[PDB]
Amino acid sequence: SKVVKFSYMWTINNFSFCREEMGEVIKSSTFSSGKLKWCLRVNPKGLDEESKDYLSLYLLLVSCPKEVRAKFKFSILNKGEETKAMESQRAYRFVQGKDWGFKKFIRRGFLLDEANGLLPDDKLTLFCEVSVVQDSMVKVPECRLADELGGLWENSRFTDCCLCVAGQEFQAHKAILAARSPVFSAMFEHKNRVEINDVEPEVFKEMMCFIYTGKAPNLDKMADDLLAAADKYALERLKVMCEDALCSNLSVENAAEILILADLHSADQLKTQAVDFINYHA
Amino acid sequence: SKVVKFSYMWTINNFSFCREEMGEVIKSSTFSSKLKWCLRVNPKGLDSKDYLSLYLLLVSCPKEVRAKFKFSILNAKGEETKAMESQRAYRFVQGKDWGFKKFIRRGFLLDEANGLLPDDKLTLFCEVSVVQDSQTMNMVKVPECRLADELGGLWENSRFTDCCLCVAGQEFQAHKAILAARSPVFSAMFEHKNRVEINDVEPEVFKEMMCFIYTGKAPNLDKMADDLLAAADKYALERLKVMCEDALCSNLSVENAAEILILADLHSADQLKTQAVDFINYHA
Amino acid sequence: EVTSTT
Amino acid sequence: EVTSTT
């Protein structure tokens, strides 16, 4: 017998702000205790009609090596103590994609009432304690796929085509570009020199970097240009990563300018946040 | 926080017949959960004489341990009686012991009117618990990385392939770039002609090693950890070697540790070799 | 009372 | 009461 306990503290700012309607969920970020990734789930206004006036809180097992028994307890931190705790009588069985919790954890009326101090500064901070139970490991290195692939790009290795960015000549790989981008694909399928005249070389270097490693380390300093590049080459995740880089900078200074930028490259998430920002500041 | 709970059952035959006086000690076999424990008992006490003193002794360990313990006597029905427990975790170190000097009276016990010694056998039960200590939203939902999944498509549908790997007669379409950035062995080959024949790995296991090369994942690893290890080692796929060293290690059993050890010596599986040795000894 | 959606 | 022989 072995028992592994581990906490998690989730903070949701402006609990009254979130638009989530009865039936929508806000999934927190994953977390382990040092092979399984967990995370919490919260339905600001209930799981369904029976619980429209309550908050539904569930512990969810996100990833795992193809079953785990766990007990859990939820509570809201007021000084930092525990209030309104609910916990399983026993350990429940979880599996990749399974969740367990309380459909009717706490009434919205109660939680939103200030005399309960459950939302100091309108900040709901949830607290989950998990106790995994097992009956009675090698050091695995971290995936280095994205790194070794970026090597192909940095040091030009085994290239097979040429991308011309406003005069500039870059060596790259038809296959990788194709698998990683619909626009590049359509090109190499309908022939080794591609003319690119809609992206500045500095931004292009960054954009390729994304295509080969899934990362984009200078993103925060050319988010507007990288948002338009990501848009013109169907790189949806890059596009969304530029979208929040711009969303977090959003201010009464560049809000009208970010909105425009969002309406042209059709940045869904960013357009919402900007409209919602400009209004709550009108 | 991690708590490992284990226990040990100790039976002393013909208890009332032990030639032990005040101060003599009789240890038990050492038990385990990588550290070695063991119980100690002084039938007549340590000084005091009218009681039985019981201790939990950490016999062996690699240089500090926190542990709670519960002592009790088991009746004939296997139930628990006369239990005394440490109200917290005490620390042990090589040779240190903790317990109860005055566990149970020499006279409350022997009284058959309580039957704590069936057939004049004392059944001491110990339970040990070894305790050891071991973050706002964004408003913008950012998709999870798809790099591995898309590169995987290149392998699955053979798109924009540029070389051929003949695995024991069977031909597979691949990509020199990806194989070279991914393997020191393949890179070294394409260095010095679009056709490489593999003669040391079986087709099924091969498809699995390519699946890893392109995605950093090996879904069917469990079904072939030994062969995929052999393959991972020959093509210098370090992470996949260890991912297999890990799979094999978790399956170590009585009737197979001999086998898996040999595998480890042949494929230089440092970690797995250690875990297999340590396992054989734990069962000497 | 504990419940799930899965 | 818990104690040690040492």
Swiss-Prot record, chain A:
Keywords: Cytoplasm, Host-virus interaction, Intellectual disability, Nucleus, Ubl conjugation pathway. Belongs to the Tdpoz family. The gene is SPOP. Residues 5-130 form the MATH domain. Residues 92-102 are annotated as: Important for binding substrate proteins. Residues 42-150 are annotated as: Required for nuclear localization. Changing I176K: Strongly reduced homodimerization. Reduces the activity of the cullin-RING-based BCR (BTB-CUL3-RBX1) E3 ubiquitin-protein ligase complex. Component of a cullin-RING-based BCR (BTB-CUL3-RBX1) E3 ubiquitin-protein ligase complex that mediates the ubiquitination of target proteins, leading most often to their proteasomal degradation. In complex with CUL3, involved in ubiquitination and proteasomal degradation of BRMS1, DAXX, PDX1/IPF1, GLI2 and GLI3. In complex with CUL3, involved in ubiquitination of MACROH2A1 and BMI1; this does not lead to their proteasomal degradation. Inhibits transcriptional activation of PDX1/IPF1 targets, such as insulin, by promoting PDX1/IPF1 degradation. One of its GO terms (cellular component) is nuclear speck. It is found in: Nucleus; Nucleus speckle; Cytoplasm. Its main location: nucleus. This is Speckle-type POZ protein. It is linked to Nabais Sa-de Vries syndrome 1: An autosomal dominant disorder characterized by global developmental delay, impaired intellectual development, speech delay, and variable behavioral abnormalities. Affected individuals show congenital microcephaly and dysmorphic facial features, including round face, small palpebral fissures, highly arched eyebrows, and short nose. The chain holds residues 28 to 329 of 374 of the full protein. Changing D113N: In NSDVS1; gain-of-function, reduced BET proteins stability. Interacts with GLI2 and GLI3. Homodimer and homooligomer. Heterodimer with SPOPL. Each dimer interacts with two CUL3 molecules. Part of cullin-RING-based BCR (BTB-CUL3-RBX1) E3 ubiquitin-protein ligase complexes that contain CUL3 and homodimeric SPOP, or the heterodimer formed by SPOP and SPOPL, plus a target protein, such as MACROH2A1, PDX1/IPF1, BMI1, BRMS1 and DAXX. Interacts with IRF1; this interaction mediates IRF1 proteasomal degradation. Interacts with HNF1A. Transmembrane segments: none annotated. Widely expressed. Antigen recognized by serum from scleroderma patient. Residues 145-176 are annotated as: Important for homodimerization. One of its GO terms (molecular function) is molecular function inhibitor activity. One of its GO terms (biological process) is regulation of proteolysis. Pathway: Protein modification; protein ubiquitination. It comes from Homo sapiens (Human).
